[PDB]
Write a structure and sequence with these properties.
This is part of a larger assembly, with chains A, B and C. Chain A has 2 helices and 2 strands, in the order H-E-E-H. In chain C, helix 3 links the parallel strand 1 and strand 2. By secondary structure, chain C is mostly loops. Chain C is built from 3 helices and 2 strands, in the order ααβαβ. The chains are: A little secondary structure, B alpha/beta, C little secondary structure. The chains hardly touch. Chain C binds 5 RNA strands through helix 1, helix 2 and helix 3. It is classed as ribosome. The entry lists the keywords eukaryotic ribosome, 80S, RACK1 protein, flexible fitting, ribosome.
Chain lengths: ~120, ~120, ~140
RNA sequence: CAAACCAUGAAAGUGUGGCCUAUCGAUCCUUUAGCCUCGAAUUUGAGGCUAGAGGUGCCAGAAAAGUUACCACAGGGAUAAC
RNA sequence: ACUCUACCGUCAGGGUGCCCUGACGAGUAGGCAGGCGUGGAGGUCGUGACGAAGCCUGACCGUAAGGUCGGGUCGAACGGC
RNA sequence: AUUGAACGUGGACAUUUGAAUGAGAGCUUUUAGUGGGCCAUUUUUGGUAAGCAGAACUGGCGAUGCGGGAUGAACCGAACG
RNA sequence: GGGCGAAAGACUAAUCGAACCAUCUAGUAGCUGGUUCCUGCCGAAGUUUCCCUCAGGAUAGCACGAAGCUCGUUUUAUGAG
RNA sequence: CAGCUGGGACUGAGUGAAAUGACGUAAGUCAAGGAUGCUGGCAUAAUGGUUAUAUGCCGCCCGUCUUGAAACACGGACCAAGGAGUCUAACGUCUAUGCGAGUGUUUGGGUAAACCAUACGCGUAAUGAAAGUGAGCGUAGGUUGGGGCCUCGCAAGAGGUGCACAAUCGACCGAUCCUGAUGUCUUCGGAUGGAUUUGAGUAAGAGCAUAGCUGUUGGGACCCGAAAGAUGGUGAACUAUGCC
């Protein structure tokens, strides 16, 4: 029936956005990551070389580290086989930013004992 | 599986273990049942390393399987060895080094408590 | 030879009822393609050629002795068969091997202890000569 | 990412020819160029990287056409008249 | 089923001899363990012509497997260990 | 330049008494089996003329007691030594 | 594979489109059928990458057998009709 | 409430125990913890037994294929004979094991099933279309420093020697460090989980032989059902054709 590869099934994950069409601004372009930054993913046909895969969008993830410099960097995410170390390669523009709220729970909790 | 001497050594070890236990009474008891590789033939080259330059010759080696007698173990390293089979070289060269070659039967007679003990694979 | 399990089931040597020569897939199998046999998408088969065959490795190829420098040495600080210059062993004195065989080197590895022995062999390998020379020796002839 | 490394630019600068976006051929072989391993022994016969020739379209590849009813044998609604 | 309490199956832990005792136990392939099995035999004494195997018939423990005793009868064979 | 980490070093951050460690899930590996199934519930592409034919999701049977149903594996209640 | 034809491969010991008898020969059958104790522990699967490949089988999915160890209920969010 | 009313469940009785309990009494009961009797299903050592048998109610039996046959699928009159995974023999886990860092053989000798001999094995070499080496049972790869040797040319510099030592990285052993409980003390010692550091060895497979077992390639090869080839005989007794 269908062939695989590019736009099949999840055409939106290949696609840009109608509202946010046109060339991508210098938001996630210049925002490079390091160890333990939680991030998201959504592609486009705006960034040609270093486009991530469509099946491995939908999933969230965390950045392992940025390896050497900016490009050739990785995002960790599980694939639905079973729990396994799986990642995905991409360059900077496709990577987003998310929940840095949860880890600040420990620093909030530590204001405990000195209230005696 | 039934080694006539070794399955009688199970009923020896449990009789001591369920009264005056040792950590060598725990580990070696499982490996009286278990198979070929799980009864390791330890060489006296790996005893010459582990039991005295690195690790302590205070800690006495309770060998699980047999004792093979590699090289010609010198007057410098040594430990007191107890095992299943003891070979002619181990009856010579361990005595030359400065230890006894005993047996697991006599560990129950000597001191089942494990004050200064290790095993070796 | 489990007569009890085998004769009172008749599955031993067969499997399920109609398994005939489909199951072992004939007997043997070839190189390339054929129907319903044990060939399929196998990983063995390919290359074929057995043996490390070359015109150098055949007749008149003289064998080496099993002869390390330290494996020879271990018997020496016990036995006083050999001579002592520094120490001074022979090749074929603590060792068998290089009686009949054509040449006789002194060979292999191990990060060498400080043993100033002098060996009396036919030839020498590259292995032993550097190690033993650093320790404080050399090869001597027989 | 770093070196090799020529011509362009004030420099910053970004790419191993391409706007996201289908577009072809193995073992076997063939023959050629680049040049690391050889039989007293100076050469040389014989033999293993890599790159290219050649519509094997089923794209993962054996020169080249068949009625089959005198008739024999083993199987099959895996398959049909019905 | 629900539910009471007991009983049957392997295994664990505490402490041997094994007992307490948890959780589950419909069943085909299949593997392992355990138990019953023929011909034969190193062994072989024990039983025998004052009655052996066998034939035939009765008693006949209980885990599914099939085996000891006893009666009518045999006219030489066969098991402790 | 700077980024990223480990050590040195200060602070934030709970304690008394007695005894001791639970799995309903992961990983490794020798000597088998499957490699051809049925039905009910629900939605899709599709002939709502038909059991035309295809894709998703779920229970029981396959390998299940017993009761209900005049007769009927799937449903209802439900688990069996 | 010869004998033979005005033809029908009629004909040759009831066998002739290749006589009959005996041997190698127990040829061989990728297909089908049949196939011998018991209980207990314990027990799945009809799914797949892929094939000059299709009543098969390399591999993978799922539980065999044996040794040594292995959950979640749910809370904050993030991504996608 | 035992007014009254129906049951499961427990204690106890000649003689006559041990361990874990409570309350009460000049008394004892509950609670514990010690101990049944006959058939029944039916394979191997039971009561006085085989058994015709009214009336009434339950009530559809297999080896095999398949999701699926008591079924109108196959397969017995009935009894006895014969028979369907197996004494070859290779590989790999494992049981048992004399003996092990060297051990264990064989022909044969011969004290004859004994005992002696120890030839010789034991998981075994990278890799370059054509210009070497032979790796310690077998022992290599990746990266790098030091040094020995030869040739050309102006020692300007270019090329192998990196075969090998060794430096250095890795499965991993063993040590080291830390968390909480923790014997024992402000001193040593035991165990567990995780991580860093640091020292060192083995193709890390750290023994060979043997009785034996397993599934399978092979072996009388699980038992059964074919059409068919080559080779050597015998048939024109019948019959197609020939001739007189």
């Amino acid at each position: 029936g269908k062939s695989h590869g590019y736009r099949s099934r999840t055409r939106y994950m290949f696609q840009r956005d109608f509202r946010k069409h046109g060339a991508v601004h210098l938001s996630t372009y210049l925002k490079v990551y390091k160890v333990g930054d939680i991030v998201d993913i959504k592609a486009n046909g705006s960034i040609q070389k270093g486009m991530p895969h469509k099946f491995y969008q939908g999933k969230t993830g965390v950045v392992y580290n940025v390896t050497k410099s900016s490009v050739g960097v990785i995002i960790n995410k599980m694939v639905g086989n079973r729990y396994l170390e799986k990642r995905l390669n991409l360059r900077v523009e496709h990577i987003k930013h998310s929940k840095a709220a949860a880890a600040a729970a420990a620093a909030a909790a530590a204001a405990a004992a000195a209230a005696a | 599986s039934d080694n006539v001497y070794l399955k009688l050594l199970v009923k020896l070890y449990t009789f001591l273990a369920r009264r005056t236990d040792a950590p060598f009474n725990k580990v070696v008891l499982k490996a009286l049942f278990l198979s070929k590789i799980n009864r390791p033939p330890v060489s006296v080259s790996r005893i010459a390393r582990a039991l005295k330059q690195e690790g302590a010759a205070n800690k006495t080696v309770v060998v699980v399987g047999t004792v093979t007698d590699d090289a010609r173990i010198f007057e410098f390293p040594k430990t007191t060895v107890a095992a299943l089979r003891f070979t002619a070289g181990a009856r010579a060269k361990i005595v030359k080094a400065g230890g006894e070659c005993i047996t697991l039967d006599q560990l129950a007679v000597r001191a089942p408590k494990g004050q200064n003990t290790l095993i070796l694979r | 030879t489990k007569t009890r399990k085998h004769r009172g089931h008749v599955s031993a040597g067969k499997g399920r009822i109609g398994k005939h020569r489909k199951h072992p897939g004939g007997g043997m199998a070839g190189g390339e393609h054929h129907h319903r046999i044990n060939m399929d998408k196998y990983h063995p088969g390919y290359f074929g050629k057995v043996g490390m065959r070359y015109f150098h490795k055949q007749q008149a190829h003289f064998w080496k002795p099993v002869l390390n420098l330290d494996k020879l040495w271990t018997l020496i600080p016990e036995d006083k068969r050999d001579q002592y210059l520094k120490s001074a062993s022979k090749e074929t004195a603590p060792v068998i091997d290089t009686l009949a065989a054509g040449y006789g080197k002194i060979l292999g590895k191990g990060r060498i202890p400080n043993v100033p022995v002098i060996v009396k062999a036919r030839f020498v390998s590259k292995l032993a000569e550097e190690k033993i020379r650093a320790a404080g020796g050399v090869v001597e002839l027989i």
